[PDB]
Structure formats: C-alpha cells, structure tokens
Amino acid sequence: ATSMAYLPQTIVLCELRHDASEASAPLGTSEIVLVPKWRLKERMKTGCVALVLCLNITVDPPDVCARIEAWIDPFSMAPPKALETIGKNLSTQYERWQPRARYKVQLDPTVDEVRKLCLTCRKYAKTERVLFHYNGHGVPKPTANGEIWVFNKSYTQYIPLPISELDSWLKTPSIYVFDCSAARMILNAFAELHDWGSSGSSGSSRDCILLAACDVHETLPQSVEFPADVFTSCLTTPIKMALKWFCRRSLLKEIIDESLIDRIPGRQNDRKTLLGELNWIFTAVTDTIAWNVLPHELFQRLFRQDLLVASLFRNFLLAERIMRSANCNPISHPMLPPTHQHHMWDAWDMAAEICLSQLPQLVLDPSTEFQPSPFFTEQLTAFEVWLDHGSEHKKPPEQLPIVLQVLLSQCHRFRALVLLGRFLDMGSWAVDLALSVGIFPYVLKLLQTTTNELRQILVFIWTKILALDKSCQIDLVKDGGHTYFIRFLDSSGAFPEQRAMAAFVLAVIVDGHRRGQEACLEANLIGVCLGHLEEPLFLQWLCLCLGKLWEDFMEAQIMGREANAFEKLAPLLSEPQPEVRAAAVFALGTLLDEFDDDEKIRAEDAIIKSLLDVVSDGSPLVRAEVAVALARFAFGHKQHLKLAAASYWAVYSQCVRAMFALAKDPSPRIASLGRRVLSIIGIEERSLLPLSTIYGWSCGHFSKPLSQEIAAKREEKEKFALEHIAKCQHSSISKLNNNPIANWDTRFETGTKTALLHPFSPIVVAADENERIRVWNYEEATLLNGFDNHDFPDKGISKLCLINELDDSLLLVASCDGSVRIWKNYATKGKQKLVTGFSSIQLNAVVDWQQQSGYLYASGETSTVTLWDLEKEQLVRSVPSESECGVTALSASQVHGGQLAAGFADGSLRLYDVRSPEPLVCATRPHQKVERVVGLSFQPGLDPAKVVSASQAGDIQFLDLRTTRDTYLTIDAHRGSLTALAVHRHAPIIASGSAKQLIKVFSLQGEQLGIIRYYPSFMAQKIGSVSCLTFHPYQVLLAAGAADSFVSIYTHD
Amino acid sequence: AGVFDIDL
C-alpha cells in the first residue's frame, strides 16, 4: 500500500565498520596479533645407522620352530655367509626409507666392537640423529638390571653390555630399535638412567626415542607363519609383511599363491604402479590413524620431523597390530595410545584384498590393466559428508591427513584442493588443523602449477592461510610464490572478488617485509595494480597493496610518482564507500617520506592537499587515516609547521588548521590522534607516530567464511505501526487528560532542553543543556541509562532523533556547534557505545534526520543547508538557503524523500527539494511579525502541506503550498513568547508551549483540546523555556519540559 | 620440507 511511505526499509550504520560489544575492532585499535604453535624449524635428519646383529646360527641361547631373518633362511646358506647376507639385506631394507645416511653393520660383536661402532656413529652424525638397531635373537634376554647381551671373541660366553654404557656412547639425538624378547626391560632401564624431572610429561627429558618389540614377560613368536624378524620386518618391510600376514590369517591362505607378494609389479615410488599405490595407501592409512589418535605436539615430533622416524613410527602401527596376534605388545618411548583396531585398518584390509586378488592375473601377463583403487575417492567422499553434517568444533574430520596425500598426485588434485578450501573456510581453527597435518609445503609447491583449473582454488587456500598467519611471507617470497598471485591480478581469469584475494595475498606478502617489497617491485606490482585503477573490495585492496608496497621504501615511492599513482589514487578519495576512501588515504599517506622544487615537492604538496580535502570526512574510519598521513607528513616538516603554528596561535598553515581541527573532533579516538599530531610538532623518535589501522581491520574480512529472526522483529514493528497509524488517523481524539501519567525529576539544575518518546517501547529520552542524556522509563517509573554526550567544555544540545526505528534504534544527538553523535545500546544500564561522530556544518545548529532517503540535513546561523548521506558518510550537497538570515527551525518530511522545510530568524519559510538542480521550491512569509520560527513540521499526511510556523510571536499558521501562499488557518496559541511546538506524525493533533508556563493542545482543524500549566516548584518564576514538547510517534502521548527540572507526560484518557 | 613426495 501507500503506507509503505510510512515504513522505510533503508537501514543505516549497521555495517561491520560500526561494530558493537566485544569488538572495538571497528577502528582505532590495532589488529589482533597471533602467537603460533605449529613451529618446529629443525627438520631433523637421521645421519648414521648402526645395525648390531647378535645371532649364533644353530646355537640357541638357554631361554628356550621359526627362523627366517631379513627374508633369508639362515640355515640355507651356512652360518658365516648367512650372517653376511642378513646384514646386507637388513641394511638395504632400512636404506630404502633413508637413502642419504651412513649404514654400518656389526655381526655377533664384542662389547669393544659395539663401543667403537657407537662412538664412530656419534662422531659422524654430530647433531644429527643416530639409529641403533639391536637384534638379540641368538643371545639371552635383557636383564632387570638393564643389560643387553653380546659376545666375547671366541663365542664361548654371552657378555652383558649394560644400557648405561650404550647411552654414554650415543647421546641426545638418537633413536633405538630392539627386536628381541622381553624388550621392555631395556626401556625400563633407559627410564632410570637419568635424574627424574627435566620435563612436564609422564617420564621424559632427553631426545632419546625407543622402539621395542614386546613386553617384559613376553617372548617373540615361534610359529612358522611368522619369521624371527617379525618386529624388524614390520618396521622395515611393512607391505611385504602386511600382505603375508593377511594371507595366512584372514582369507585362510591356501587359495592365494603367497609368493606372488614377492613378485608384486612396479616400484615403491610410482603411485601409478600396483606396488607403489599399495605403499601409498599404507602410508595414507597409517598416517591418518596416528593423526587422529595423537596430540598436535607428539604427532609432529614423531610423524613430521624426521623422514626415518616418520617411517619407523608409521610402520610401528603395523607392528602394534601383527605382534598383538602373536602374544606380543610393543612399546615406543614416547608411548602413544592403542592403535590396533582403529576404524581405518578396515580400509587397509579392503584395499589389500582388492590388490591381492588382482595380483594373480597381472602375473599371467604384464597387461598393465591395473585399476587404481577406489580408496582415495572413497575417503574424500567421507570428508564431504563431514563438511556438511556435524561440521563444527565437533572433533576433527579424520580424513584430513588423506586429503594431504591426494594433493601429492594429480589423480584427484582439484577435488582435494576444493574440499580443503571448503574446510579452511569454516574458520581459523580449521586453518590451524590443516597446517598441523602439514599442508603448508605442498600447497606452497603447487604455486609452480600452471594449470588454470587450480589457480582460483589456490589463491583462496592461500588467502585463508595468510589471513591466519602473516609470517608465511618469508616462505612465499623465497620460492617466488609472489609471482603466482601477480599473474592472477593480470590474468584473463574473471571474477574480481578472486582478484581482491590476490591483492590481499600480495599485500600480506609485502607487509613490513623489504625482501617481499623488492621482489614485487621487480615484478611490476605497481604497474599491475595501477592498471586496474581506471568493485569496492577490489579497489580497497588495490590501495592497501600499493600503500604497503611503497611504505618506508623510497625506490617504490619514486616508481609510484613516475607512474602517476597520485593521479590515479586521488579520485578514490571521493568514492561512496568509506572503506575505499580510507584505504586510498592510506596509499597516498605512505607515498610521503625555503623555496625549492624537485619532482617530489610537487607530488607531496599535491598529495597532502588532497588529504586535507578529506579531513572533514563523515566516516571516522577515513578521518583516522587522514590524521596518520598528517602525522607522517608532520614528522618530515616540523621546521615549517612550528613556524606556521607560531603566527596562528604556503601549505603549512592549512596543516595546522587541520591538526587543531582533528584535536576537537567529536569521535574521541580521532581527537586523541589530533592531539598526538600536535604533540609531534611540539604543541601542548619515530615510535611516537600513530600507526594506520585500515589494513589491519580490512584483513579480518578474509579470516571469516565466504539471519531469519532479522525479519521477525521487523514485521513485529511494521504490523504495530501500520495498525497504530490507522488508529491515530481514524479515532476521534478527545480532550487532554490533565492528570499527567508522570512528572519525572530530571535533576537538571538548569532544566530539560529537548526530549524524545520511543515508538515501540515505553521509553523517554531527555537532554540537559550540557548534553547529559537520561533514558527514563514511564511504565516502570525508572532510569534505564545516563550519559555524558562528550567531555568537551563548550556544551550545547540541538537535537535528539532515532535512527533505524524499525530495527534496533540508534540515538542521534546533534550539538549546537553542528557535531552529530550516534549511540548504540543507549537503553542499556551503562553499555552505550559511540557508533559514529562527525561535524555537520563546516552558530545555533539545527538538524533533522530523514530515514527514507538516509539524509541528514543540518544548518543554523549560516547561508547554506548542508546535506549528509549516512549510507556513504559523505557531504552530498551544500544548498544555499537564499535567506540572508539564520535557519531557526528545520523539518524533513518522513514521507517524501529529499523534500525539506525550513523556518527562519525573520519569520520566513522555505521549501527545498534537495534532489533538484535548483533546490529552493518556494519561499513564503506567513505569520507577519518578524520573529523567529521556533518550530515547524509537515502535516500528518501524504502531501506537501504544512502545520509549520509557530512563530515566537505566538501564531501557529497552517498552509497548503500546492495551491496558495497565504494560510489554510491561523491559530493564536499565545500572546507572545511561543517557546516550542509539537506536531504529531500521524494523528490529527498539535501542541504548543509558552514562556508564560503554559501549554495548549489543539486539533488540526483549530479546536482547543487542552490547556496545561507547568507550575514552578519554587518562586524563580522561570518556567520560561518550555522547550521540549514532543508526541509519541504512534500514540497520542505528549511530553513536556521546561526551565525548571521536570519532564511531565500526558495522554487523552 | 614435507615427509611425503609430490608429483608435478
């Protein structure tokens, strides 16, 4: 209906730069600094490996059939050749996991031989880790006194080598493997070697890692289905062992030729061969179990630090499973939870059965009709299922380590990257989880992939990573990763939201990082960016990128000048979006740093001038940035600016104006910046300069993913309003109930000056002459809040208005000097934040708010009416009034956007249509005394007719300006000294106040509806400023206040 | 930097 004029859908000042309770982020405050946890720089290497092998062949030790070792029958070759070959095999078996490390073998040794072995390994691999592999199968079991058994020369005795002396020979960075019976006994000895303390875990201290085959009481298996070398052959030859175990147990065994496992085609590297793909799946399966089972710190040490420890501890989870089946329970020193029977070995068992059945026919002919296992595809689907349902901080997604494994092969690279990005998007926690798995270096190497299929996803992944951790700068620049995103800025690949991310990724790459600046400078990032300057987030981030590039880097600054950067940036200072403008100010701001002119003085004068044009900006966000650029400039020109400040107390006098202007700004955070800039000049070493915040605030956009009750309370109020509009109109309004429903003591010593009834709640707002703001409830007879609108000494209240009545009202408070302050949560007991503050008019300021258009009209004792668009926070228009005397009163129409009424000091009246090339519509006298118009308003209706024109002379004059100049109707409110007027929004009713104590309500046709007399509380006889008369918007409730100290409320029974 | 190989 037409009553959609009465209900404006325009919301204003409810954007992220106007943020509320927890976040003082909006601006002023610096960005939230982080402290990372995933950081262990030391990529450790196992440099030396000592294989000690204690087996007399056909001489069992007296603690006693199966006897295979390193996949050799030691009886088949005779003792000395057998023991050589097993030494050679076991070496190459280990060597496949760590090919760049030295391997030294020791067969049936003396204690003296082991001493030199260990001393030599430690001397070879100084800080690097040393591996000790012991095999005590042909010697007695380790003691409870902490002993290993070796030989003497002649092989007549078993000689006890104590663990103490081993651990003296090898030191700190070392790792042990004990493939013997009763192997725990060694680990218990190790635990007691050193003094307890030196840690905050179960029982640790050094960097001594220990893998052992079985428990204290336990003995290694004896059945022929296992070898003797079970633990070793799990740890060192996992696939061969896993399958051979699988045949002999699960499928029952006699169907499948077991020796096909030895003849599996391909090599362990090729993921496209059947062997290497089975080895891939194993790593993927094993690594996944470890990640879901262990905590961040322990997993990273064992599974991410050393290529060989990662292999050994991966392959240890197979031992955890197999040994178990043969009455053995192995233990590592960093102990790790139970790993067998995890829902994931199930997936291995499946993949191995599908492999082993296939193997029979691939041997019949090398057909290479090897179907890649579904495993990977199957698991990425279970990651998608997780990403929909339960996708919270509701325990990790489990498939995550497998998503990493897929990034390593083109086979399913795009969907993996897509799903990873989908996962990173849900928050910082998910970025923290991904980086913990170890996604960083793989995603970093993918910045050499030319495939355009990827890049759009890769920019997004990197956006999310760099939104969390800024420090990846160093790694990105070192690999030339910066070029990947510069390409993306200059690409033909569409979508400018992707390009903003590119510009953000580069801005972070550059941020306080001269290696990155210089790299991007050579890569022509000034040219790339400035090419695009001819969407708002993209513009915002081009400036932030450019600004960060030249910041404190004079080569780039020179390049920016001689690429006319000022000429391209400056036009963004007019843009409607505050975010853009503020970013534009930043960019020009960071370009900075008698009678002489060289190149730069032409630029830096032209820059600072263009910044000073935006000192008066409506957004504090902008003003903050302008003050920082002024601070920077002020640093460089202290010589000149002090001399300019001497005479004030070419361009420098303009700066001093702006500094003192900033110091008296309504937003106190801006004010304090102005006070800072002043103090840099010496009015009352770089570290004193304030720092820009526009970059830090904007970055939060990316660390944030890329509802219904919003409409609920909207329609609540609209239904209430539409109904009460019709009732206001259609009910035949009776006389005033002179018995007031409240007579509230403000405790304003001088009295109440302006007041405001709330539409959708039972609330009053009142204002002192010093701009204290109270929020009185009339239905509870209580105070909801108390304020001080600003601490400045020169006070003065002009106006109170609600902004966004239909959805969480903000309280506008206009001051007589033209300052405007808008407060959220003004009804709360003392949690009431200043949302925005700016100086309209650039006195006796008068103001009015038009929700329909988003326009704030402001003027006073000035030639002009000033127009503010609060969606933009800009000074949209300066309309000359064409009066040559002051605007005393000012009413914007609720219905018709743009259209404005204005009363004047000489009693005159003017319409404006502020959206017209010539704004003044008509100019009329009506009432003819030559006294100021104390109040006016458009009539309650849907036309441009006008109650208007209460003159201070006392006559209220009605006029319909479509048809005639002279008056509809005159009503004589008061013989002189009319001090206020109130015109209802919808109901056909008005009211007027006198300095002679008196208040008179009238009908719109002119009838008297009720006299009231505000009596004085003592005999000052000064009820002479009956200033606040105001109606409830949707009800017939009056509210009256005066030069005494009471706010009385009335109604019509 | 990583434990596992990558194909490109």
Tab-separated table of N, CA and C in Angstrom, chain A residues 156-244:
chain	number	residue	atom	x	y	z
A	156	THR	N	82.350	-68.155	23.201
A	156	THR	CA	82.182	-69.120	24.297
A	156	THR	C	81.190	-68.620	25.355
A	157	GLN	N	81.214	-67.314	25.614
A	157	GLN	CA	80.359	-66.683	26.620
A	157	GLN	C	79.400	-65.665	26.002
A	158	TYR	N	78.257	-65.479	26.658
A	158	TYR	CA	77.411	-64.315	26.426
A	158	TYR	C	77.875	-63.254	27.429
A	159	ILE	N	78.287	-62.088	26.923
A	159	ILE	CA	78.799	-60.975	27.738
A	159	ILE	C	77.697	-59.923	27.908
A	160	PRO	N	77.433	-59.468	29.154
A	160	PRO	CA	76.395	-58.459	29.345
A	160	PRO	C	76.929	-57.042	29.110
A	161	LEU	N	76.364	-56.354	28.120
A	161	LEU	CA	76.627	-54.936	27.878
A	161	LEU	C	75.524	-54.131	28.567
A	162	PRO	N	75.874	-53.332	29.602
A	162	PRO	CA	74.839	-52.544	30.276
A	162	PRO	C	74.364	-51.364	29.432
A	163	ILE	N	73.091	-51.020	29.594
A	163	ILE	CA	72.447	-49.933	28.846
A	163	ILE	C	73.077	-48.565	29.133
A	164	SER	N	73.531	-48.366	30.371
A	164	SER	CA	74.253	-47.150	30.783
A	164	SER	C	75.380	-46.772	29.819
A	165	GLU	N	76.238	-47.746	29.527
A	165	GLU	CA	77.415	-47.535	28.681
A	165	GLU	C	77.069	-47.345	27.199
A	166	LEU	N	75.997	-47.981	26.723
A	166	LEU	CA	75.446	-47.685	25.386
A	166	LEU	C	75.062	-46.220	25.273
A	167	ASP	N	74.246	-45.768	26.221
A	167	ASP	CA	73.710	-44.409	26.215
A	167	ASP	C	74.765	-43.341	26.496
A	168	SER	N	75.928	-43.740	27.012
A	168	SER	CA	77.090	-42.848	27.076
A	168	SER	C	77.720	-42.676	25.688
A	169	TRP	N	77.812	-43.772	24.931
A	169	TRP	CA	78.469	-43.778	23.612
A	169	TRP	C	77.676	-42.977	22.562
A	170	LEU	N	76.396	-43.310	22.406
A	170	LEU	CA	75.437	-42.487	21.645
A	170	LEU	C	74.917	-41.446	22.623
A	171	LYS	N	74.341	-40.357	22.137
A	171	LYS	CA	73.916	-39.281	23.032
A	171	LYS	C	72.737	-38.524	22.452
A	172	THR	N	72.198	-37.582	23.234
A	172	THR	CA	70.976	-36.794	22.936
A	172	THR	C	70.243	-37.210	21.645
A	173	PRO	N	70.612	-36.653	20.455
A	173	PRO	CA	69.760	-37.007	19.317
A	173	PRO	C	70.058	-38.434	18.860
A	174	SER	N	69.265	-39.374	19.368
A	174	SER	CA	69.381	-40.779	18.986
A	174	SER	C	68.062	-41.538	19.188
A	175	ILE	N	67.948	-42.658	18.473
A	175	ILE	CA	66.739	-43.483	18.419
A	175	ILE	C	67.163	-44.946	18.415
A	176	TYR	N	66.394	-45.793	19.092
A	176	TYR	CA	66.758	-47.201	19.279
A	176	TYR	C	65.659	-48.121	18.739
A	177	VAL	N	66.049	-49.300	18.246
A	177	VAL	CA	65.101	-50.380	17.906
A	177	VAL	C	65.607	-51.678	18.532
A	178	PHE	N	64.760	-52.327	19.332
A	178	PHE	CA	65.109	-53.588	19.996
A	178	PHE	C	64.177	-54.705	19.554
A	179	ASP	N	64.658	-55.498	18.599
A	179	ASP	CA	63.963	-56.689	18.149
A	179	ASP	C	64.542	-57.859	18.930
A	180	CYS	N	64.005	-58.033	20.130
A	180	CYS	CA	64.336	-59.165	20.990
A	180	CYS	C	63.174	-59.466	21.926
A	181	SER	N	63.223	-60.633	22.560
A	181	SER	CA	62.241	-60.995	23.587
A	181	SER	C	62.472	-60.135	24.820
A	182	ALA	N	61.414	-59.939	25.601
A	182	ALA	CA	61.492	-59.214	26.871
A	182	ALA	C	62.052	-57.780	26.731
A	183	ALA	N	61.702	-57.098	25.643
A	183	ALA	CA	62.393	-55.860	25.247
A	183	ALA	C	62.064	-54.617	26.091
A	184	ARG	N	60.859	-54.554	26.658
A	184	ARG	CA	60.509	-53.558	27.700
A	184	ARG	C	61.588	-53.344	28.754
A	185	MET	N	62.196	-54.446	29.183
A	185	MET	CA	63.251	-54.445	30.196
A	185	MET	C	64.351	-53.424	29.909
A	186	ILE	N	64.659	-53.244	28.624
A	186	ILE	CA	65.599	-52.214	28.173
A	186	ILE	C	65.017	-50.805	28.361
A	187	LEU	N	63.766	-50.608	27.961
A	187	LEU	CA	63.128	-49.296	28.084
A	187	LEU	C	62.989	-48.857	29.541
A	188	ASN	N	62.727	-49.808	30.437
A	188	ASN	CA	62.641	-49.514	31.868
A	188	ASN	C	64.011	-49.101	32.395
A	189	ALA	N	65.070	-49.736	31.888
A	189	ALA	CA	66.445	-49.352	32.236
A	189	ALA	C	66.760	-47.925	31.798
A	190	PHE	N	66.523	-47.641	30.518
A	190	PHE	CA	66.653	-46.286	29.959
A	190	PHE	C	65.978	-45.212	30.806
A	191	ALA	N	64.764	-45.495	31.273
A	191	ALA	CA	63.988	-44.544	32.076
A	191	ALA	C	64.677	-44.182	33.385
A	192	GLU	N	65.439	-45.131	33.927
A	192	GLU	CA	66.144	-44.968	35.201
A	192	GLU	C	67.602	-44.500	35.068
A	193	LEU	N	68.067	-44.268	33.839
A	193	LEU	CA	69.437	-43.814	33.605
A	193	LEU	C	69.688	-42.397	34.085
A	194	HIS	N	68.674	-41.545	33.996
A	194	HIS	CA	68.841	-40.131	34.313
A	194	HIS	C	67.921	-39.678	35.429
A	195	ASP	N	68.249	-38.509	35.975
A	195	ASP	CA	67.561	-37.973	37.141
A	195	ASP	C	66.169	-37.506	36.746
A	196	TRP	N	65.190	-37.831	37.587
A	196	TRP	CA	63.787	-37.577	37.274
A	196	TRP	C	63.425	-36.115	37.511
A	197	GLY	N	62.645	-35.585	36.569
A	197	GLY	CA	62.478	-34.151	36.353
A	197	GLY	C	62.846	-33.853	34.908
A	198	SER	N	63.324	-32.633	34.664
A	198	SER	CA	63.765	-32.190	33.333
A	198	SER	C	62.669	-32.267	32.247
A	199	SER	N	61.395	-32.181	32.654
A	199	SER	CA	60.236	-32.287	31.738
A	199	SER	C	58.894	-32.052	32.460
A	200	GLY	N	57.806	-32.062	31.684
A	200	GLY	CA	56.429	-31.952	32.199
A	200	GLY	C	55.463	-32.902	31.503
A	201	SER	N	55.885	-34.160	31.367
A	201	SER	CA	55.076	-35.238	30.783
A	201	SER	C	55.107	-36.448	31.748
A	202	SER	N	54.914	-37.670	31.240
A	202	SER	CA	54.946	-38.881	32.078
A	202	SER	C	56.334	-39.128	32.684
A	203	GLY	N	57.328	-39.293	31.814
A	203	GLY	CA	58.711	-39.518	32.238
A	203	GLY	C	59.700	-39.383	31.094
A	204	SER	N	60.019	-38.137	30.745
A	204	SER	CA	60.914	-37.810	29.626
A	204	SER	C	61.947	-36.750	30.049
A	205	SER	N	62.891	-36.449	29.152
A	205	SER	CA	63.930	-35.422	29.385
A	205	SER	C	64.773	-35.125	28.131
A	206	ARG	N	65.470	-36.154	27.636
A	206	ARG	CA	66.418	-36.038	26.509
A	206	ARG	C	65.669	-36.185	25.181
A	207	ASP	N	66.409	-36.344	24.077
A	207	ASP	CA	65.829	-36.696	22.771
A	207	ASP	C	66.135	-38.164	22.425
A	208	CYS	N	65.803	-39.049	23.361
A	208	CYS	CA	66.066	-40.480	23.235
A	208	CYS	C	64.755	-41.204	22.898
A	209	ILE	N	64.653	-41.724	21.676
A	209	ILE	CA	63.453	-42.436	21.204
A	209	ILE	C	63.733	-43.939	21.186
A	210	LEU	N	62.770	-44.736	21.637
A	210	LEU	CA	62.991	-46.170	21.835
A	210	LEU	C	61.802	-47.003	21.343
A	211	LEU	N	62.042	-47.873	20.359
A	211	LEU	CA	61.054	-48.848	19.874
A	211	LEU	C	61.457	-50.240	20.337
A	212	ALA	N	60.527	-50.966	20.946
A	212	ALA	CA	60.811	-52.310	21.437
A	212	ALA	C	59.670	-53.284	21.097
A	213	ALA	N	60.046	-54.521	20.771
A	213	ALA	CA	59.151	-55.497	20.144
A	213	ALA	C	58.022	-56.026	21.025
A	214	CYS	N	58.301	-56.260	22.302
A	214	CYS	CA	57.327	-56.908	23.188
A	214	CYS	C	57.480	-56.427	24.629
A	215	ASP	N	56.609	-56.918	25.514
A	215	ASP	CA	56.611	-56.521	26.933
A	215	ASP	C	57.737	-57.219	27.732
A	216	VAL	N	57.785	-56.966	29.045
A	216	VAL	CA	58.815	-57.512	29.951
A	216	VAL	C	58.777	-59.047	29.993
A	217	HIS	N	57.624	-59.570	30.393
A	217	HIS	CA	57.371	-61.015	30.473
A	217	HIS	C	57.292	-61.729	29.111
A	218	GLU	N	56.883	-61.013	28.065
A	218	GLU	CA	56.647	-61.623	26.745
A	218	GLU	C	57.897	-62.096	25.992
A	219	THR	N	57.668	-63.080	25.123
A	219	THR	CA	58.681	-63.694	24.266
A	219	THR	C	58.170	-63.630	22.836
A	220	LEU	N	59.098	-63.471	21.893
A	220	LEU	CA	58.767	-63.350	20.470
A	220	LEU	C	58.142	-64.654	19.958
A	221	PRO	N	57.325	-64.580	18.888
A	221	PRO	CA	56.622	-65.781	18.426
A	221	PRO	C	57.544	-66.881	17.918
A	222	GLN	N	57.017	-68.105	17.875
A	222	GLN	CA	57.758	-69.276	17.394
A	222	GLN	C	57.138	-70.025	16.201
A	223	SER	N	55.868	-69.779	15.875
A	223	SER	CA	55.231	-70.469	14.749
A	223	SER	C	55.819	-70.004	13.417
A	224	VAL	N	55.719	-70.872	12.415
A	224	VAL	CA	56.373	-70.665	11.118
A	224	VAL	C	55.654	-69.602	10.280
A	225	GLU	N	54.380	-69.330	10.577
A	225	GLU	CA	53.651	-68.251	9.886
A	225	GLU	C	54.299	-66.867	10.081
A	226	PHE	N	55.044	-66.690	11.178
A	226	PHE	CA	55.897	-65.511	11.397
A	226	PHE	C	57.366	-65.873	11.154
A	227	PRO	N	58.196	-64.878	10.768
A	227	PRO	CA	59.643	-65.061	10.830
A	227	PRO	C	60.147	-64.809	12.258
A	228	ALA	N	61.455	-64.913	12.479
A	228	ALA	CA	62.054	-64.458	13.742
A	228	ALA	C	62.089	-62.928	13.769
A	229	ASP	N	62.273	-62.355	12.579
A	229	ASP	CA	62.483	-60.926	12.342
A	229	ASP	C	61.157	-60.154	12.270
A	230	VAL	N	60.179	-60.485	13.117
A	230	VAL	CA	58.795	-60.002	12.916
A	230	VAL	C	58.744	-58.485	13.082
A	231	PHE	N	59.215	-58.019	14.239
A	231	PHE	CA	59.181	-56.605	14.593
A	231	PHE	C	59.958	-55.775	13.580
A	232	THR	N	61.170	-56.223	13.262
A	232	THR	CA	62.021	-55.572	12.265
A	232	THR	C	61.334	-55.554	10.899
A	233	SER	N	60.870	-56.716	10.452
A	233	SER	CA	60.222	-56.840	9.141
A	233	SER	C	58.865	-56.106	9.037
A	234	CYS	N	58.215	-55.818	10.167
A	234	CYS	CA	57.077	-54.877	10.191
A	234	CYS	C	57.582	-53.451	9.977
A	235	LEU	N	58.493	-53.021	10.862
A	235	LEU	CA	59.076	-51.659	10.874
A	235	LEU	C	59.836	-51.280	9.604
A	236	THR	N	60.474	-52.269	8.989
A	236	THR	CA	61.440	-52.043	7.922
A	236	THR	C	60.948	-52.534	6.526
A	237	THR	N	60.083	-53.558	6.481
A	237	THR	CA	59.473	-54.062	5.224
A	237	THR	C	57.939	-54.249	5.347
A	238	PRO	N	57.205	-53.172	5.689
A	238	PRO	CA	55.786	-53.247	6.084
A	238	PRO	C	54.821	-53.909	5.087
A	239	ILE	N	54.923	-53.568	3.804
A	239	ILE	CA	53.959	-54.057	2.813
A	239	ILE	C	54.087	-55.573	2.668
A	240	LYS	N	55.300	-56.024	2.381
A	240	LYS	CA	55.584	-57.447	2.257
A	240	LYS	C	55.048	-58.228	3.460
A	241	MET	N	55.230	-57.666	4.650
A	241	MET	CA	54.777	-58.286	5.895
A	241	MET	C	53.258	-58.233	6.060
A	242	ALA	N	52.681	-57.070	5.789
A	242	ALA	CA	51.241	-56.865	5.929
A	242	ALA	C	50.422	-57.857	5.098
A	243	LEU	N	50.858	-58.106	3.866
A	243	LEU	CA	50.137	-58.993	2.953
A	243	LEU	C	50.334	-60.447	3.350
A	244	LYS	N	51.588	-60.842	3.558
A	244	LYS	CA	51.918	-62.202	4.014
A	244	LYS	C	51.190	-62.592	5.302
